[PDB]
Amino acid sequence: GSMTLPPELSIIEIPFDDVETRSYEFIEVEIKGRGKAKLGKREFAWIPESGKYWADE
Amino acid sequence: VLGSFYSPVKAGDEPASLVAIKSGPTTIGFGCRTKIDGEDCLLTAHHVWCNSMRPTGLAKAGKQVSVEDWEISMSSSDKMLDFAIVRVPTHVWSKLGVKSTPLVCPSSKDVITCYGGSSSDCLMSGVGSSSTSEFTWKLTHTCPTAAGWSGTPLYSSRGVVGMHVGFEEIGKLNRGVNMFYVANYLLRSNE
């Protein structure tokens, strides 16, 4: 299921690890229903597009 | 509006942390010196150092130096954040007499002074307040800005709370980016 991956891996950025991880004030910005930005102290995941891999600009 | 909402700034009396980014005979934006990666760097808007014309030199109170191949720390291509971080050598800071004014944590309502102008020799300033949005990366400010002021830091008595990137509603409210959160939360020491 949706679980965090060990630091032994290269790069992994899933919304789950940012749902919770920084539980104080995790950013919540959504748009178009297909894209959503999230913030955190140990994560950087934010792409309001269809690919979610940064294919807009 | 020029003269009423803005007040002329005495050349040489302007913040030693603010610098004007010039592209030939025209200015492309504003920026400031601050610590983000750990050493020292120049903070400005993304467009200015990406979408706008090629930055040829930096101007500070008439003093202008040439911009060479300077390494860029990181710059998000997003239009909401729109920021760029350039790593400028230390022997360049002194050439213009630029100091490193650190950015601090913004507040719900703090006083800010925005500085801008057509050139570094023709500077003016505005006065407004800064606020924090629900999103820790978005700041709201009433500081009266003009065209070409993008990159101007929100100077407060306590320090810099954010940087002017655009506006929320034309003629109503502007928009600034919270570098504090991007610096110690979004930016990693890997890139």
State how far residue A2 is from chain B, nearest Cα, in angstroms.
22
B53 and B93 housed in the same domain: yes
- Domain that residue B81 falls in: 16-100
B175 and B134 housed in the same domain: yes
B85 and B47 housed in the same domain: yes
Please check whether residue B85 is in contact with residue B39, taking contact to mean a CB–CB distance below 8 angstroms.
no
B33 and B109 housed in the same domain: no
Q: Kindly determine whether residue A27 and residue B79, on different chains, have CB atoms separated by under 8 Å.
A: no
Look at residues B79, B100, B121 and tell me which one is the last residue of a structural domain: B100
- In whole angstroms, give the CA distance from residue B115 to residue B7: 9
- In whole angstroms, give the CA distance from residue B154 to residue B175: 11
B79 and B146 housed in the same domain: no
B109 and B188 housed in the same domain: yes
Look at residues B100, B126, B151 and tell me which one is the last residue of a structural domain: B100
B120 and B80 housed in the same domain: no
B78 and B162 housed in the same domain: no
Look at residues B40, B75, B100 and tell me which one is the last residue of a structural domain: B100
Please check whether residue B30 is in contact with residue B74, taking contact to mean a CB–CB distance below 8 angstroms.
no
B37 and B8 housed in the same domain: no
- In whole angstroms, give the CA distance from residue B36 to residue B128: 25
Please check whether residue B59 is in contact with residue B67, taking contact to mean a CB–CB distance below 8 angstroms.
no
Closest residue in B to A47 (Cα) is B78
Q: Which candidate from B77, B135, B185 shows the least CB-CB separation from A29?
A: B135
Elucidation technique: NMR
Please check whether residue A47 is in contact with residue A38, taking contact to mean a CB–CB distance below 8 angstroms.
no
Which residues on neighbouring strands pair with residue A37, listed in sequence order?
A29, A46
B53 and B122 housed in the same domain: no
Q: What residue spans define the domains of chain A?
A: 15-46
- In whole angstroms, give the CA distance from residue B101 to residue B129: 19
Q: From the centroid of its chain, how far is CA A57? A: 18
The domain total for chain B is 2
Token pair listed for B146: 């003009």
B180 backbone dihedrals φ, ψ, rounded to 5° = -55, -45
Residues in chain A with CB shorter than 8 Å from the CB of B188 are: 44
Token pair listed for A30: 């959504």
Rounded (10°) CA dihedral B75, B79, B81, B83: 40
Residues in chain B with CB shorter than 8 Å from the CB of A43 are: none
Does the annotation count B47 as an active-site position?
A: yes
B51 lies within 8 A of chain A by CB: no
Q: In chain A, positions 20-39, which contact chain B (CB-CB < 8 Å)?
A: 25, 27-29, 39
